[PDB]
Ligand SMILES: Nc1nc2c(ncn2[C@@H]2O[C@H](COP(=O)(O)OP(=O)(O)O)[C@@H](O)[C@H]2O)c(=O)[nH]1
């Protein structure tokens with residue numbers, strides 16, 4: 001089968017790791033201690049075609065480092081995650097897109113905008129705002145909760161579809 005290396009980026013505490021664990025292990029974690037070793041592999045079927053997802057979680061890597069750059073050289077598609085209750089994480093998204101464009105040395109990198117923690121009450125970012133930013137990038141936007149599992153499969157599977165159209 002094809003193997004898809006998907007890299008999850010975003011500000012601290014937005015839920016990169018819980019999203020990854022929810023996808024792979026079908027559990028929601030209340031806390032996650034990152035390592036240098038957190039890649040996760042899982043076989044899934046997307047649109048009738050079996051494939052392998054290799055999820056690389058960037059949690060805990062420094063904002064600018066050789067390891068983070070190596071991680072995104074290896075990635076074929078990217079999830080840019082913010083949290084819908086943290087406006088600053090949504091404002092940081094352009095920084096992660098600029099970083100991916102730099103490392104991949106391209107303006108057309110498979111990417112999906114992910115608005116996580118959609119179960120929480122104190123929303124500060126509208127779906128319309130996020131859709132408008134995704135639209136400016138020409139990429140899909142998906143709303144998720146690693147806790148209720150809403151949108152989790154959709155976000156990773158849509159990213160695979162994005163790779164499959166490149
Ligand atoms: N309610 C809620 N909490 C979440 C969600 N995603 C992550 N969290 C919590 O947010 C905190 C940070 O999550 P983590 O995955 O470690 O974020 P990361 O640093 O970006 O990898 C943890 O306490 C998680 O339990 C979500 O969708 N909903």
Ligand SMILES: [Ca+2]
Pocket residue numbers: 021022023024025026027
């Ligand atoms: Ca799962």
Ligand code: NA
Pocket residue numbers: 012013
């Ligand atoms: Na954290």
